[PDB]
Symmetry: C2
Subunit: 62 residues, 2 copies
């Protein structure tokens, strides 16, 4: 599985996930800077209020 791992509006970067991993994630919140996005491999648990998205296809998390 290949997942995007770039932050917010940065130039797109990718990461090859560890074997057995079939999910990519998109985590969004806000700070003084504006809209923040964290991307990676997997599907982590987030604190209430944080928007989370998980997908199961190559570079599905833009």
């Amino acid at each position: 599985r290949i997942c995007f791992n770039h932050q917010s509006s940065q130039p797109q970067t990718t990461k090859t996930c560890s074997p057995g991993e079939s999910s990519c994630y998109h985590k969004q919140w806000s700070d003084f800077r504006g809209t923040i996005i964290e991307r990676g491999c997997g599907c982590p648990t987030v604190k209430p209020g944080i928007n989370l998205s998980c997908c199961e296809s190559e570079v599905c998390n833009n």
Copy 2:
């Protein structure tokens, strides 16, 4: 939980999921006609070749 349940780029419609359901889904594939989007409550099982995205927030599946 409230999720979008409209197809492709058709007028937006939502659906009230059953209690306990915290997920919304976004499934995308391409038939002879091209890109097709399907939305709803939960996070269903999908066939290989169809891109599934599940999110956990109100009408998160646009």
